[PDB]
Design a protein around this ligand. Structure first.
Ligand code: ZN
Lengths: 75, 318
């Protein structure tokens, strides 16, 4: 299926993913496109932070859904 | 030859005999005696009467008890937790201006933001026993276990700086409400139709992406499954408290007519390098800046806010 990832630049990229794909798996694809390491990625979906262990179907993320990429801070 | 005990929960033990020809790692595995990694030494005498703490190569019954106690965890969760628990023993919780806080050490200012924010969340508990155990323990004056646990779950490394919001929401994802709260979203698409979505529990109290209640109630716009424009708007919301979180945003916080929120966290420095976290609350008519062991009580602040906590909610879309 198709999902959207609002990047840090402000642009929107498009990923082809499966419901069984883990959040980490998505972050890996984002890495190859944006050049951002999975460690420093925070994916947000409708106000919920996506924990690494889960999958897209777990968070009820279907086609045309929009994930938000937030940079991991260092305090 | 010696004979020692082995546990992973501090309740169920098993008697194990190890030879003095091979180390713990090759005979038994990763173990912690008296809070120290002895998994590369040779069996001695003061441990030939007391107990150890296994981390890897568990039994079917220990793995069973692990899931009951720690929930589903990383294969390295046990090792990291033992290591962290020993490392954070030196940390201390002070009492800065009738509020407790984590004293600055080994880049733990982000952890101060998390804990001090957690302490302001009413009616919450944890599904995982060990977590809830360490939580109630924390409420009473010893917070060593709790700190080490949330660091273990958030994959925090000792001494390394980290994200406070990220850790806070990872923690809350393993928590639940000891009361009730509802959140009603009205989604609609000109083609597909109107659909109401209800959120109930702790999930109704947290939202990442906005920092003002007004923006939470504003009509949001995204893409429907058909490809067309889809909309969403909060039309009903009742919570004991509302936690809004977003990217560091520079707001002009002034106590002159103090805004709706009770507390907020602040990221100082530049977000591409290593910065600093400061927890802030609203007591009286002045701001209270809690800097991991300090209490600046000035009444004005131009800062980059991150997490913003609001009181109970009660809203209807007329
Ligand atoms: Zn539609």
């Amino acid at each position: 299926m198709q999902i959207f990832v609002k990047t840090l630049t402000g642009k929107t990229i498009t990923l082809e993913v499966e419901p069984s794909d883990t959040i980490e798996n998505v972050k890996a694809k984002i890495q190859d496109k944006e050049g951002i390491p999975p460690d420093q990625q925070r994916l947000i979906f409708a106000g919920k932070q996506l924990e690494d262990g889960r999958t897209l179907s777990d968070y009820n993320i279907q086609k045309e859904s929009t994930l938000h990429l937030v940079l991991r801070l260092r305090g | 030859t010696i004979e020692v005990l082995v546990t992973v929960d501090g309740v169920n033990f098993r008697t194990v005999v190890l030879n003095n020809k091979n180390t713990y790692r090759s005979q038994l595995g990763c173990v912690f005696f008296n809070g120290a990694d002895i998994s590369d030494t040779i069996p001695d005498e003061k441990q030939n009467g007391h107990s150890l703490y296994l981390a890897d190569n568990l039994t079917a019954d220990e793995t069973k008890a692990l899931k009951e106690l720690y929930g589903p965890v990383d294969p390295t969760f046990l090792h990291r937790f033992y290591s962290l628990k020993a490392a954070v023993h030196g940390w201390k919780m002070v009492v800065c201006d009738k509020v407790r806080s984590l004293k600055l050490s080994d880049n733990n200012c982000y952890l101060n933001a998390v804990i001090m924010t957690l302490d302001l969340l009413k009616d919450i508990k944890f599904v995982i026993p060990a977590l809830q155990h360490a939580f109630m323990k924390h409420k009473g004056g010893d917070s060593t276990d709790f700190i080490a646990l949330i660091m273990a779950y958030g994959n925090c490394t000792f001494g390394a700086p980290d994200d406070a919001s990220r850790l806070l929401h990872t923690v809350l994802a393993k928590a639940e409400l000891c009361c009730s709260a509802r959140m009603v979203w009205r989604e609609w698409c000109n083609v597909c139709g109107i659909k109401d979505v209800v959120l109930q529990g702790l999930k109704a109290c947290c939202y990442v992406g906005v920092q003002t209640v007004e923006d939470l109630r504003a009509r949001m716009t995204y893409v429907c499954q058909c490809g067309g424009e889809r909309h969403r708007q909060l039309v009903e919301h009742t919570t004991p408290w509302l936690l809004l979180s977003g990217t560091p945003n520079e707001k002009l916080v002034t106590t002159s007519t103090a805004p709706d929120f009770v507390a907020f966290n602040v990221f100082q420095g530049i977000e591409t390098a290593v910065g600093h976290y400061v927890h802030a609350r609203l007591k009286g008519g002045l701001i209270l800046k809690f800097d991991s062991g300090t209490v600046s009580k000035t009444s004005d602040w131009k800062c980059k806010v991150t997490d913003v906590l609001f009181p109970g909610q009660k809203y209807s879309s007329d």
